């Protein structure tokens, strides 16, 4: 689909069997979700944003469905203010910026 | 143009007679540029993201050229690790997300 930016680019995603709202964020290298439980082994990591760095849990090879399209990759979980879909998964669904 | 997301979507912008590289960020509501002296009145403002909040200065009706496309809007200035073009200006150049 074509998504204009007059509003936040929010989409529904399906992960771990749950439905969640997420922002298609071209300004994030990674995908970061709010605290939640995901299966598998996780390792501690730190990421940076506009107001500093935070600690997150990294889960590898996690299947995620973004607005229908399928992706499988790294998902970070931690105290982010909103669920974010970053470039690591946006590239998998063939997303581009056009103008 | 069509920009792929394999790498950060950086482009050249023109503001106040200066050329800079800025990240096209569909994940930012506003445009935030790294510290730079801009003439004109401004208002104090706090904006937040991952990690917390930073204090910035808000300037209005600032002409900005994004890859040859003319736009004019609000520009926030503060200690941001990178120059960021947000939705307020992206909508002006008819930028869309497509997949």
């Amino acid at each position: 689909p074509q998504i204009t930016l007059w509003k936040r680019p929010l989409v529904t995603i399906r992960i771990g069997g749950q439905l969640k709202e997420a922002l298609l964020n071209t300004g994030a290298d990674d995908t970061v979700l709010e605290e939640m439980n995901l299966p598998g082994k996780w390792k501690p990591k730190m990421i940076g944003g506009i107001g500093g760095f935070i600690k997150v849990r990294q889960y590898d090879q996690i299947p995620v469905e973004i607005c229908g399209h399928k992706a499988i990759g790294t998902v970070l979980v931690g105290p982010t203010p909103v669920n974010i879909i970053g470039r690591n998964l946006l590239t998998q669904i063939g997303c581009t910026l056009n103008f | 143009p069509q920009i792929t997301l394999w790498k950060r979507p950086l482009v050249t912008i023109r503001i106040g007679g200066q050329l800079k590289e800025a990240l096209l960020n569909t994940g930012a509501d506003d445009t935030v540029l790294e510290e730079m002296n801009l003439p004109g009145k401004w208002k104090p403002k706090m904006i937040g993201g991952i990690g917390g909040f930073i204090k910035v200065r808000q300037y209005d009706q600032i002409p900005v050229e994004i890859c040859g496309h003319k736009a004019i809007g609000t520009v926030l200035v503060g200690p941001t690790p990178v120059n960021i073009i947000g939705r307020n200006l992206l909508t002006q150049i008819g930028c869309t997300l497509n997949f």
Binding site: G27, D29, M46, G48, I50 | D30, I47, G48, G49, V82
Partner: peptide, 10 residues
């Protein structure tokens, strides 16, 4: 209000 979600790794 949280409105700028820039994000990157170290």
């Amino acid at each position: 209000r949280p409105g700028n979600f820039l994000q990157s790794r170290p």
